[PDB]
Amino acid sequence: GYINAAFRSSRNNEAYLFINDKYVLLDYAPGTSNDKVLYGPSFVRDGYKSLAKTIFGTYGIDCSFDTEYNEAFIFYENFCARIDYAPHSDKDKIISGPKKIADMFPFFKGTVFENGIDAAFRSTKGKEVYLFKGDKYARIDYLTNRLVQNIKSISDGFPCLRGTIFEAGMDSAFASHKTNEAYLFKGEYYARINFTPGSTNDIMGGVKKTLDYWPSLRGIIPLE
Ligand code: NA
């Protein structure tokens, strides 16, 4: 029971992470030690009234990403929705959906993302987002609804991961507030990386034990 999804929050240095059918709001504190928990672990169906009677309230969120303002896409197997998470309040709501990924993102039909996406994170460039499934990755634009490029292996677009455990998949991910940095997770490990849109680059060395560098997650992952 490790992190299966996360998205960056509009609120500075805050991020929501999803574990099983639960979630936690966190001040991850990118370049600082005061990495702390703000809310939860709490059940999605409890923290999000808009999802109480949904498949998401029942099983949780398995992949997601922030878009713009207080909104994020959340997934659960072949289904997804756009929600306004209403940071630090009662007022969350489902904006679009829930629909199938195939119906929310027509370009995914026939590809390996059709029935589920492993993880994702927002790019700093325009309205672009990167999504992962297996050892493949997608770069999309959510406003104009298209694949910016052909889907290809994670190593092709993210060479710094070749050799690492992320080569073959990501349980979860979210973008950092610090420019062009993202956080990736798989099992007990994570990695902070610096990416550059339209380019194939390293780097950020140090795949690390997540609990080793996230004081605030002890007692929370692994959730059993
Ligand atoms: Na996931």
Q: How far is CA 111 from CA 31, 87, 102, 125, 162, in A?
A: 37, 33, 10, 24, 23
| 8 CA to centre of ligand 1 in angstroms | 15
Q: Cis link prior to 106 (omega < 30° from 0)?
A: no
**Domain tally for the chain?**
1
What does the alpha-carbon distance between residue 27 and residue 187 come to, in Å, rounded to a whole number? 21
Closest by CA to 115, choosing from 75, 162, 69, 72, is 75
Q: What share of the chain is helix, strand, coil (3-state, %, to 5)?
A: 15, 40, 45
Spell out the residues 6+ positions from residue 46 whose beta carbon is closer than 8 angstroms to its own. Answer: 52
Asked if residues 176 and 8 have their Cβ atoms less than 8 Å apart, the reply is: yes
Binding residues: 4, 62, 118, 171
Domain that residue 51 falls in: 1-224
Q: Tell me if residue 179 falls in helix, strand or coil.
A: coil
| 2 CA to centre of ligand 1 in angstroms | 9
Q: Is 163 left (phi over 0), alpha (psi -120 to 50) or beta?
A: left
61-82: b or e for each residue (b if 16 or more CB lie within 10 Å)? bbbbbbbeebbbbbbbebbbbb
Domain with 190 in it: what CATH number? 2.110.10.10
Phi and psi at 161, nearest 5°, equal -95, -15
Burial-class residue 46 by CB neighbours within 10 Å (0-12, 13-18, 19+): middle
Resolution in A: 2.6
| 123 CA to centre of ligand 1 in angstroms | 18
| 54 CA to centre of ligand 1 in angstroms | 18
CB count within 10 Å of CB 91 equals 12
What does the alpha-carbon distance between residue 187 and residue 211 come to, in Å, rounded to a whole number? 11
What does the alpha-carbon distance between residue 201 and residue 48 come to, in Å, rounded to a whole number? 38
Between CA 55 and CA 188, with CA 70 as vertex, the angle to 5 degrees is 60
Residue appearing with tokens 């299966």: 4
- Start-end of H helices in the chain: 44-47, 55-59, 101-104, 154-157, 210-213
Q: Is 187 left (phi over 0), alpha (psi -120 to 50) or beta?
A: left
Q: Which residues pair with 16 in a beta bridge?
A: 7, 25
